[PDB]
């Protein structure tokens, strides 16, 4: 169904069509350069101008104005319908899940005399994400991911999300010492990223690609005829969400094996947005299509040597010959019912090994739905309770909290 | 095959090995060993000595060996067992699971050591499982780890045979003696007996 919002937007004929925000820093993060690239559609005129202003609350920190026309990029010239403005910020307040400092950037399309054609805005978080010497760093410091996987689920409204439920989830997660969320397994409602920017949570943004039921799992992802469809799902997500500071990692999807399309899209992301690592678990969790070893349900000490996709113990995985990447479990500690035995073992290992930088619990909230018996009394239902067949019964309930967000 | 260089008693341990005035003496002990033994097939690894800290002389002699005999790896434990003067992480008495974070020369657990950022070398303990008396508790843990981790390629037990000496009482009856039994002082008593076999080669 139509399970997210529907709206009408009116733009002028000459309009802002895209804008990108990037932050660069010096070695000690005491100086930052805010680079904003703005793109337009419509008739170009010599009087057109673009102004980008950066605000910290009520105070304007930086500003820049320029006519359209980018730098030369190849033999034929540059983009006449683009402009890049670079704003210097001294001693910027850095964004993190601990302290989510935010600035407000306003992008103005206006004529030279001063009349405003159109304005767009976005929240700006100054932070640098990079993998150096096998460690994932945020603002120069190695992260320890206290993560959880979260589906968009409501026991009454199905997969329709609301701001109140989102805020309730974020507050509960932070109150229970979580600092990261994986959008399993699709781009979320747009307000989710804004709330994560505001409250402080690292976000893994995941493409809407999962072909788990295929035999073999990469039958489609290794087929060039499905490359366009896969590419749309990756590229449109990046184009929508690349400005959000909370998003620190891109994911190519979930449980789709490993095919050449994964490698192609990994490289596309690395080319378009070098500011964020790319991860993907399929094909054994350490393929060429991931910057992070991200296995699902690899155990702390016990090896699980399956054919062609083994789940080594996470301690052993780090030291395999020629392996240097960090390891962050994209799913672990399956919380189905009376569960989470052995969680302390994982966290002992996370604290002992530098390149074990945490993981994402599976998962946040039970996917139970509400039904009414013969007396209007509600009761929580799972797979098979709606006449659906074949079904997977109670495997939909793997959460740390009940569907009404009461804790397990 | 190990060079005859050990300066364990120095304070700090590299006081001589970091002094260029002792480089000739150290170089003689390395180079003459290599010149004598480089034809033996059984020799697969050279060692620069034992427990002498880490000084520039170690790096110089490591490179000399690498230049003259590229056919054998070079190892050295001093200075924390993972310095620039060794091709193999070769700690002494690093434990399987427990870290021992001493200042400037920590003994990480061997499993953790392999995965330290930027570390790629194999790990072979030059000494482990100290067999002093009723000992070798926990040996199975080491060998479980050795079999599970590819880059944990074993180690050298300390050590083979007790260093006890024979003395005779008032009736010509022999008895095994250790440190201090010859009037030697100061001494380190029974720490000379760390072997898997007695001095007469009967097994423990
Ligand atoms: Na860690
Ligand atoms: Na499930
Ligand atoms: Na091994
Ligand atoms: Na001894």
From Swiss-Prot, chain A:
Quaternary structure and partners: Homotetramer.
Protein name as it appears in the record: Beta-galactosidase
Amino acids binding substrate: 255, 331-334, 398
Outcome of substituting residue 334 to E/F/N: Poorly reactive with galactosyl substrates. Less stable to heat than wild-type
Family to which the UniProt record says this protein belongs: Belongs to the glycosyl hydrolase 2 family.
UniProt binding sites for Mg(2+) 2: 391
Effect on the protein upon substituting residue 395 to A: Decreases the stability of the loop 794-804
First and last residues shown, out of full length: 208 to 615 of 1024
Active site: 255 (proton donor), 331 (nucleophile)
Induction text: By allolactose.
Transmembrane segments: none
Gene (UniProt): lacZ
Site feature location: Transition state stabilizer: 151, 185
Domain of life: Bacteria
Binding of Na(+), residues: 395, 398
Binding site for Mg(2+) 1: 210, 212, 255
């Amino acid at each position: 169904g139509i399970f997210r919002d529907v709206s009408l937007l009116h733009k002028p004929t000459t309009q802002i069509s895209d804008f990108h925000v990037a932050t660069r820093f010096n070695d000690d993060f005491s100086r930052a350069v805010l680079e904003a690239e703005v793109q337009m559609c419509g008739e170009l005129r010599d009087y057109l101008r673009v102004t980008v202003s950066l605000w910290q609350g009520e105070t304007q920190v930086a500003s820049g104005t320029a006519p359209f026309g980018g730098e030369i990029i190849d033999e034929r010239g540059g983009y006449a319908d683009r402009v890049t403005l670079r704003l210097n910020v001294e001693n910027p307040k850095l964004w993190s899940a601990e302290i989510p400092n935010l600035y407000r950037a306003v992008v103005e399309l206006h004529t030279a005399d001063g009349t405003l054609i159109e304005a767009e805005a976005c929240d700006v978080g100054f932070r640098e994400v990079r993998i150096e010497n096998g460690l994932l760093l945020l603002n120069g410091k190695p992260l320890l991911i206290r993560g959880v996987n979260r589906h968009e689920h409501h026991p009454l409204h199905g997969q329709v999300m609301d701001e109140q439920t989102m805020v309730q989830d974020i507050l509960l997660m932070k109150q229970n010492n979580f600092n990261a969320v994986r959008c399993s397994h699709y781009p979320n409602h747009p307000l989710w990223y804004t709330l994560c920017d505001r409250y402080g949570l690292y976000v893994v943004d995941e493409a809407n690609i999962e072909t788990h039921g295929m035999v073999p799992m990469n039958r489609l992802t290794d087929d060039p005829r499905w490359l366009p469809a896969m590419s749309e799902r990756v590229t449109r997500m990046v184009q929508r969400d690349r400005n959000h500071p909370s998003v620190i990692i891109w994911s190519l999807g979930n449980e789709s094996g490993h095919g050449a399309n994964h490698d192609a899209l990994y490289r596309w992301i690395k080319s378009v947005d070098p500011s964020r690592p790319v991860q993907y678990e399929g094909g054994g969790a350490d393929t060429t299509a991931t910057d992070i070893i991200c296995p699902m349900y690899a155990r702390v000490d016990e090896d699980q040597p399956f054919p062609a996709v083994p789940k080594w113990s996470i301690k052993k995985w780090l030291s395999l010959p020629g392996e240097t990447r960090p390891l962050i479990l994209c799913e672990y500690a399956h919380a189905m019912g009376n569960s989470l035995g052995g969680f302390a073992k994982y966290w002992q290992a996370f604290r002992q090994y530098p390149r074990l930088q945490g993981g994402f619990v599976w998962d946040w909230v039970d996917q139970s739905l509400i039904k009414y018996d013969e007396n209007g009394n509600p009761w929580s239902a799972y797979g098979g309770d709606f006449g659906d067949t074949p079904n997977d019964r109670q495997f939909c309930m793997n959460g740390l909290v009940f569907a009404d967000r009461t804790p397990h």
